[PDB]
Amino acid sequence: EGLVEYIDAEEEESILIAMQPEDLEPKRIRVSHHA
Amino acid sequence: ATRRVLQEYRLTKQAFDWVLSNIEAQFLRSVVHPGEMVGVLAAQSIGEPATQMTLNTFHFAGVASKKVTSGVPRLKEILNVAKNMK
Amino acid sequence: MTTFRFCRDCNNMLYPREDKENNRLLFECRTCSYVEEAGSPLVYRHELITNIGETAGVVQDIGSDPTLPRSDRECPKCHSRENVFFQSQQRRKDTSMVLFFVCLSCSHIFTSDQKN
Amino acid sequence: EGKRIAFGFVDRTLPHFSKDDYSPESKGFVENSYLRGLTPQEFFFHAMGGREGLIDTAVKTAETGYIQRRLVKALEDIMVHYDNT
Amino acid sequence: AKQNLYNAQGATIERSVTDRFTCGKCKEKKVSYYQLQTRSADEPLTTFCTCEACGNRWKFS
Amino acid sequence: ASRHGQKGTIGITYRREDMPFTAEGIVPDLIINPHAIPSRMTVAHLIEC
């Protein structure tokens, strides 16, 4: 259904990944990445 | 020295004789005993810290502009008497 | 800046030659009879150290690379505030850290170093 | 190797960053503590830092062993005599 | 001439300044430090302290 | 061994009478030394406990 994708160690050179899902919206120290 | 004895220590005659005798006795017991195998002692003394030297060799690796050989490779080159240093 | 010149007959590069009785330079092809007249006494050039300003390299369709950062600086030409920015793409050891900005709309290149 | 975490990929250090990033948190800086907890990226960088020392021990054991043997074999027959020489 | 005179200089290894360790040679606490994980991970980090006033060096582990 | 790189050997065994006890009559199945915590920085051992 195009919901997940298999990525090798070469295509990874041309992608961007948000580690937590909540990092995609606009204790420890977690920084808001500028991307 | 005389001034040091009379002014800093204030030793008497008995204490002075005791100090001189003790100094001579403790010196005479420090000479090396004939029969000692000093070669293996020296080799072990030099080469025991060489085993632990590896850990902290790369501290000069913390300075990139100071890429000068020291540590295990430098000791290796000294021992081999290499004719082409790095 | 010397430029290679090809013979019009067989596409081979033209070698220089001299004309003593007229004292003039010519370009001849060693395979055919074509001879052409040299326009300048500059035939070869050998520079040693390159005083080249650092270049952003390929720019075409650079706005579709999603691993390239962004900035809100204002365009000096089209007055747009969205653009892509990156460091010099030439990989010399001694290159400075001078940025390069490519505008999103007008595709205009500029730098963060505004030296007069 | 005496420097910050170099660019393993092209113009970055990890797929979660952006090209040409020089911020400290992106080049291997851990601002947390063992009591607080490490985030994944600084955990990875700490892992590489530890791997370096592990390798160091595991091999330079053998190199130092060889040097020690050569040294002891070279000097094994030296003795203080009764002439004090 | 000024630029050349500036460019003929060597790399200055300026070290971190601190005032906690006491030097054993001149006892001036202006002793620089450098600490790293170099000893076997069975033991904690190793520090090396160098006095910037006299040139003394020592290690703590 | 525990799950944090802290392993050792049994050095002596005691019976329930010589074991230090709490006010509730609980007794430690084993006793380890605290000189193993600082240089290893195994805070996860303490948190797991």
Residues of chain D with Cβ-Cβ distance to C67 below 8 Å are 12, 18-19
Q: What is d(CA C38, CA C56) in angstroms, rounded to the nearest whole number?
A: 36
Chain D positions contacting chain E at CB under 8 Å are: 49-50, 53-54, 56-57
Q: E46 to chain F: nearest residue by CA?
A: F39
Q: What is d(CA E37, CA F13) in angstroms, rounded to the nearest whole number?
A: 37
Q: What is d(CA C113, CA B16) in angstroms, rounded to the nearest whole number?
A: 82
Which H or E element spans position C102?
Answer: strand C99-103
C27 is in an annotated binding site: no
Quote the distance between the C-alpha of residue E11 and its chain's center. 15
Phi, psi of D60, rounded to the nearest 5 degrees: -75, -10
CB neighbours of residue F13 within 10 Å: 6
Q: How many residues does chain B have?
A: 86
Residues B79, B82, B86, CA angle at the centre, nearest 5°? 110
Give Cβ neighbours of residue B39 (< 8 Å, ≥ 6 apart): D75, D76, D77, D78, D79
The answer to whether D60 and D67 have CB atoms below 8 angstroms apart is: no
- Asked if D60's CB is within 8 angstroms of B39's CB, the reply is no
- Domains C2-46 and C47-116 belong to one CATH topology: yes
The answer to whether C15 and C30 have CB atoms below 8 angstroms apart is: yes
Interface test mutation site (partner E, options D3, D56, D59, D61, max chain E beta carbons within 10 A) = D56
Q: What is d(CA B58, CA D2) in angstroms, rounded to the nearest whole number?
A: 8
The pair of structure tokens assigned to C66 is 């999603």
Phi, psi of C36, rounded to the nearest 5 degrees: -130, 155
Q: Tell me which residue of C73, C80, C84, C82 sits closest to C114, measured CA to CA.
A: C73
- Asked if C67's CB is within 8 angstroms of A15's CB, the reply is yes
The answer to whether D15 and A17 have CB atoms below 8 angstroms apart is: yes
CATH number listed for the domain at residues C2-46: 2.20.25.10
Residues of chain B with Cβ-Cβ distance to E39 below 8 Å are 52, 55-56
Which H or E element spans position D51?
Answer: helix D40-75
Residues C108, C62, C70, CA angle at the centre, nearest 5°? 75
Give Cβ neighbours of residue C5 (< 8 Å, ≥ 6 apart): C13, C14, C27, C36
CB neighbours of residue B73 within 10 Å: 13
The 8-class DSSP code of residue E36 comes to E
CATH number listed for the domain at residues C47-116: 2.20.25.10
Domain boundaries, given as residue ranges, for chain C: 2-46, 47-116
Q: What is d(CA D17, CA D21) in angstroms, rounded to the nearest whole number?
A: 7
Quote the distance between the C-alpha of residue D8 and its chain's center. 18
CB neighbours of residue C62 within 10 Å: 14
